Design an enzyme around this catalytic site. Structure first.
Site, mmCIF file in Angstrom:
data_model
loop_
_atom_site.group_PDB
_atom_site.id
_atom_site.type_symbol
_atom_site.label_atom_id
_atom_site.label_comp_id
_atom_site.label_asym_id
_atom_site.label_seq_id
_atom_site.Cartn_x
_atom_site.Cartn_y
_atom_site.Cartn_z
ATOM 1 N NE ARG B 76 3.196 -3.972 -0.663
ATOM 2 C CZ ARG B 76 3.234 -2.849 -0.052
ATOM 3 N NH1 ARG B 76 2.043 -2.074 0.566
ATOM 4 N NH2 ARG B 76 4.360 -2.570 0.591
ATOM 5 C CG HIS B 120 5.833 -2.286 5.555
ATOM 6 N ND1 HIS B 120 5.176 -2.475 4.320
ATOM 7 C CD2 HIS B 120 5.758 -1.173 6.578
ATOM 8 C CE1 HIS B 120 4.121 -1.521 4.756
ATOM 9 N NE2 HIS B 120 4.474 -0.501 5.816
ATOM 10 C CD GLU B 165 5.190 4.189 2.176
ATOM 11 O OE1 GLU B 165 5.329 4.986 3.231
ATOM 12 O OE2 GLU B 165 4.060 3.931 1.799
ATOM 13 C CG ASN B 292 2.897 2.206 -1.206
ATOM 14 O OD1 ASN B 292 2.435 1.363 -2.140
ATOM 15 N ND2 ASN B 292 3.375 1.997 -0.096
ATOM 16 C CE1 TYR B 294 -2.646 5.521 1.907
ATOM 17 C CE2 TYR B 294 -0.042 5.558 1.529
ATOM 18 C CZ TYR B 294 -1.398 4.880 1.926
ATOM 19 O OH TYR B 294 -1.113 3.690 2.163
ATOM 20 C CD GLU B 351 1.392 0.995 1.759
ATOM 21 O OE1 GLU B 351 1.297 2.144 2.097
ATOM 22 O OE2 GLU B 351 2.014 0.385 2.349
#
Ligand code: NI
Ligand code: NI
Ligand code: NI
Ligand code: NI
Lengths: 445, 445
Positions: B76, B120, B165, B292, B294, B351
């Site tokens: 990616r 991005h 995002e 994504n 985290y 991600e």
């Protein structure tokens, strides 16, 4: 009742270039940071821009004739950097310089003394791209600009102001995001504040050098009377922080070569990019201090402004359309404080005035008794100040005419002369007619 | 028995263009908003910029060979709009298009499937000057860019992601001032959020039209697991507002054509510039949803974030060098929520990863057991999700190698491959060697 002012007292009105000139693409003018900022949604309350404004670029002679009617012996304006150095630096725009020559020639021909502000918020966008006020290189850029225009006009212009309202340029521009360029960061504001002071100090010797023995120069500070909402320690402390933030952040460096320590610590002292020799530059002697006074601000501890941990309170009293408290005594108090604490050789009120909702009557007049009462009280306070031995040499009303009031757009009218924005017609207001008498009398009633 | 993933599961690594490419002036590339933003004092914690980065623009072949060592079957990356359309619109920069053609050709030649992110965060500065994300005209600008690049690459690139995002692009960029362009205003953030969704929706039919029956496209959302600090009503409500702000603001429009109503009311519903037909555009059907993930974020009522009236709490546990809580269970919970609530046909973890302080040992190796353990737990959580019938199709680790971590600069290392910025040497970390076994085994050892 002879409340007469000193025989050479200077009675004027004030404007700024982006607020009145319009003609934003005329004659090589490049976009200022305000031309760009007005594009931003929510930036200007009525969605307007300064593109046309009062069209003073074309109508200056007519305006000067209005000033004659008003009886003023002085006129405060600002020079637009974007007209003079459209690329921000380097090539001089002859046409731009020519406008200000024509304006100054016309003023002097009518016996009106020009008081010129070098920077009143309109940095060329192309220059801001290279050096924003938080960037130290801005100092040399402003100095180059100062050098170009002062060499051209020093023969006719004796009174110069370096920068208008450092607090606004730095805090509103970079700290609160309300003014161009519209950023909101504590570090950026503090850097901007320091560089504005440095630019003022570096500019002074240039102005003196391009001038002669008559040349007088100083900075212009916005100051307001600050009060604590109560006797509580939290409120006293809040008030003290706001006072340091608004009134002392620039004055102490200019006269004592230091920032107010308690606020400095609270911010984080390292955020101010002070380098060796900066204070020597900042304290370079000035001929006068110019003051812009409007209101009393009353403060309590709170979270409204997170950075200072304060809230604002409105004491019972009279308020303008800007939601600002009317407190004429505040002007005396501020002048007295400056005079006792810093002892400037001369003081000027470079701005004082009021915005109220105005209407044109069927008779085609503008009856504005609130604005008149405002001006009367403050003129009285200035008269008291002179009687007390304060060296106040002049008073400039904000403003000559209604104009682009920044983030409030054209909706807030500060003029003693009304402007019908549909036709650009000027109508002297009742307060203006009254002022025409004060100037000729010198002054009250 | 081995915890084996599905036979076609895609194991990959992720990057973005400004974070790795460098060569910021090469081959007609114009400055992005990040090239400008890095110039701002205080913007980047270590004072760095993305000017060189990993120098991937020149070193792509070498990096691809590293990918082969890692055993990934997918890669990616993002495409830089400043390389493709340096003037923002209009003339295609063939050299820019050429880099991405060579990158994709090289990847397919090694059997690595390309997953390409259109946006991005690197808008060309010149385009932002015309259409910031808060300006509705940005939608057609992004669509033009999308059209140009999808025509050139659609024969080789099957999987496309529109924008990475939305929450970051709008909130960090325009609401918190932390990311380019560095503005801090609630209205500007909400306008930006809405226009990103609109850009995603308008882009989808373009990607489909320029593609074939194989073409798959979707958006990429950052999502984190949210918890209330306690059972108090104030804390629950705070947690709810944060959840709505972070996790639901984009997902609810994408799937249900509405913004979370309570937060919408809290903000002031008029600030979102919704026009008729917008939700029909935003809800245009997607092939998948990319996620994504985290951390777990724990919230309490507080005045730290004044816009949402929340404070953050750190529960006892393991924290990365970003001060983010390690909570692998969160990944399963997020996937399960999306699957039950929105039923996307496919899901990808685009991600997931962790930043820990890395050192090169005397032996020339990077031993990173904490990053390894982080990855193991999250991979296990993904395995559980697949066993539960959630249609997770792929997992991309953030990141292939250490890179420019935005506002934290180069100081935060997220790679499974170490980069010595003095020489650009790449050292596969222990976690990376471990990952080399996971991909080949197609599951956890
Ligand atoms: Ni008397
Ligand atoms: Ni098992
Ligand atoms: Ni090269
Ligand atoms: Ni609108």
């Amino acid at each position: 009742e002879p409340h007469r002012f000193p025989p050479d007292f200077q009675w004027g009105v004030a404007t700024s270039s982006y607020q009145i000139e319009g003609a934003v693409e005329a004659d090589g003018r490049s976009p200022s940071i305000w031309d760009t900022f007005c594009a931003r949604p929510g930036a200007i309350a009525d969605g307007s821009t300064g593109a046309i404004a009062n069209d003073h670029y074309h109508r200056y002679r007519e305006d000067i004739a209005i000033m004659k009617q008003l009886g003023v012996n002085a006129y405060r304006f600002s020079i637009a950097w974007p007209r003079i150095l459209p690329d921000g630096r380097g090539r001089v725009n002859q046409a731009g310089v020519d406008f200000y020559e024509r304006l100054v020639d016309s003023l002097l021909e009518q016996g009106i003394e020009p008081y010129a502000t070098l920077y009143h918020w309109d940095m060329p966008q192309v220059q801001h791209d290279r050096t924003p006020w938080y960037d130290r290189g801005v100092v040399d850029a402003f100095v180059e600009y100062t050098d170009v225009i002062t060499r051209r006009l020093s023969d006719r212009v004796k009174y110069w102001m370096t920068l208008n309202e450092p607090w606004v340029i730095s805090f509103l521009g970079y700290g609160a995001g309300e003014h161009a360029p519209g950023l909101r960061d504590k570090e950026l504001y503090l850097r901007a504040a320091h560089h504005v002071l440095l630019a003022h100090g570096k500019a002074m010797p240039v102005i003196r050098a391009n001038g002669n023995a008559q040349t007088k120069a100083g900075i212009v500070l916005n100051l307001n009377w600050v009060n604590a909402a109560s006797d509580s320690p939290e409120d006293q402390a809040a008030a003290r922080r706001y006072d340091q933030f608004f009134n002392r952040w620039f004055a102490e460096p200019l006269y004592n070569g230091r920032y107010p320590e308690e606020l400095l610590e609270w911010y984080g002292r390292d955020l101010v990019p002070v380098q060796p020799g900066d204070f020597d530059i900042i304290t370079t002697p000035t001929d006068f201090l110019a003051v812009n006074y409007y209101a009393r601000t009353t403060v309590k501890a709170g979270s409204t402004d997170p950075m200072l941990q304060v809230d604002f309170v409105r004491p019972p009293g009279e308020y303008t359309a800007m939601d600002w408290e009317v407190y004429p005594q505040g002007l005396y108090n501020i002048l007295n404080w400056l005079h006792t604490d810093y002892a400037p050789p001369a003081l000027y009120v470079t701005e004082n005035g009021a915005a109220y909702d105005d209407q044109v009557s069927a008779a085609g007049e503008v009856d504005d008794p609130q604005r008149l009462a405002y001006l009367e009280g403050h003129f009285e306070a200035a008269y008291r100040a002179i009687q007390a031995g304060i060296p106040l040499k002049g008073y400039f009303v904000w403003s000559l005419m209604d104009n682009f009031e920044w983030g409030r757009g054209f909706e807030k009218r500060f003029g003693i002369v009304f402007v019908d924005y549909a036709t650009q017609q000027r109508i002297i207001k009742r307060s203006g007619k009254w002022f025409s008498q004060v100037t000729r009398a010198n002054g009250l009633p």
